[PDB]
Design an enzyme around this catalytic site. Structure first.
Site, PDB file in Angstrom:
ATOM      1  N   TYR A  25       0.993  -1.273  -0.028  1.00 58.23           N
ATOM      2  CA  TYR A  25       0.034  -0.101  -0.009  1.00 58.23           C
ATOM      3  C   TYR A  25       0.780   1.230   0.149  1.00 58.23           C
ATOM      4  O   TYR A  25       2.175   1.122   0.529  1.00 58.23           O
ATOM      5  CB  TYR A  25      -0.880   0.151   1.158  1.00 58.23           C
ATOM      6  CG  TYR A  25      -2.010  -0.792   1.091  1.00 58.23           C
ATOM      7  CD1 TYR A  25      -1.900  -2.356   0.699  1.00 58.23           C
ATOM      8  CD2 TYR A  25      -3.432  -0.471   1.562  1.00 58.23           C
ATOM      9  CE1 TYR A  25      -3.138  -3.057   0.761  1.00 58.23           C
ATOM     10  CE2 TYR A  25      -4.626  -1.284   1.238  1.00 58.23           C
ATOM     11  CZ  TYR A  25      -4.401  -2.513   0.957  1.00 58.23           C
ATOM     12  OH  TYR A  25      -5.367  -3.507   1.029  1.00 58.23           O
ATOM     13  N   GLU A  70     -14.851   7.078   3.358  1.00 54.64           N
ATOM     14  CA  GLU A  70     -14.840   7.025   1.909  1.00 54.64           C
ATOM     15  C   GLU A  70     -16.232   7.008   1.293  1.00 54.64           C
ATOM     16  O   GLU A  70     -17.130   6.942   1.930  1.00 54.64           O
ATOM     17  CB  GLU A  70     -14.299   5.812   1.508  1.00 54.64           C
ATOM     18  CG  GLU A  70     -12.821   5.507   2.243  1.00 54.64           C
ATOM     19  CD  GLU A  70     -11.745   4.684   1.497  1.00 54.64           C
ATOM     20  OE1 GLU A  70     -12.024   3.892   0.758  1.00 54.64           O
ATOM     21  OE2 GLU A  70     -10.584   5.144   1.725  1.00 54.64           O
TER      22      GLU A  70
END
Lengths: 175, 175
Positions: A25, A70
């Protein structure tokens, strides 16, 4: 390598980190309220996001906590311990993201409406909660508000290019 | 005052903490995977919960992170810095909990089905995200797996009774 002590030391830092499974990531503290990220491996490999608004605090000297939610409905709480090259992230995925992760694999900024439509149409529960440590394998001083850091989709050799000094120029920009 | 260094130092600790607005929360690390809590002020004053399963880790010496998700759909990431008498919590509330917080104000353990029914019936989005520091005003060594610590609904003077040594006996039990 520098010691992180203040919030200012942390902001503007560009991170790559690896999980036990080998998934990679990438995450950038763009300013005191904004994050960009890019996913190289795992369930949502290929997903990237810019201009995600976030709460960023220093918990105590050299330890930093970032909280955000999100367009997909996903909640994230990330804790950085850069002096120990360690990160701990908890991701709370809505059920539908676990069921159909490929929907979220895109440049999210161009598909916000789709994420919002999806989170209402599909299942939210039960959540997939993923609390995991990661090892930080790259830290770069990008400066704050650097729009070049996360500015394209991930590609296979990208983390290597970044670490090897082949991705950014002397000013942490793309040529 | 004892110094927290290990995960074992943290587990079995019973906390009361206060937000700047005066609201009081109470939380107990019952074992390495279980938390109990009790709310004295604010949006959900009166709510209490036992046997909530949680991820509990030590981020680094004396700093502890707890992650869980609730029957209501709420996600929580708590970071304890007990050596500095500080906590940081992020609560990600589903929209419906912000709209109808009183539904969650109960002994949750007796109303799990109601919480799950509510989280499907009412709105999830947008989330109310509450990332805030708190000052720790009480730390007690309750030991692990002490079922007396959080074993009744909160009452007005309860935090005072606990701090004044009027609530628990010598063995951290209720008489």
């Amino acid at each position: 390598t520098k010691t992180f002590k203040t919030l200012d030391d942390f902001l503007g830092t560009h991170f790559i980190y690896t999980y036990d499974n080998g998934w990679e990531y990438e995450w950038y503290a763009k300013n005191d309220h904004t994050v960009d990220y890019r996913i190289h491996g795992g369930m949502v490999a290929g997903r990237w996001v810019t201009d995600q608004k976030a709460d960023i605090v220093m918990l105590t000297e050299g330890i930093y906590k970032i909280s955000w939610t999100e367009p997909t409905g996903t909640d994230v709480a990330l804790d950085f311990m850069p002096n120990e090259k360690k990160l701990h992230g908890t991701i709370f995925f809505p059920k539908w993201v676990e069921e159909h992760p490929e929907i979220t694999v895109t440049y999210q900024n161009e598909h916000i409406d789709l994420m919002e439509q999806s989170r209402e149409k599909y299942a939210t529960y039960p959540k997939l909660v993923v609390p995991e440590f990661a090892n930080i394998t790259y830290m770069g001083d990008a400066g704050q508000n650097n729009e070049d850091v996360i500015s394209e989709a991930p590609y296979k050799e990208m983390p290597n290019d970044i670490r090897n000094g082949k991705y950014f120029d002397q000013n942490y920009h793309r040529l």
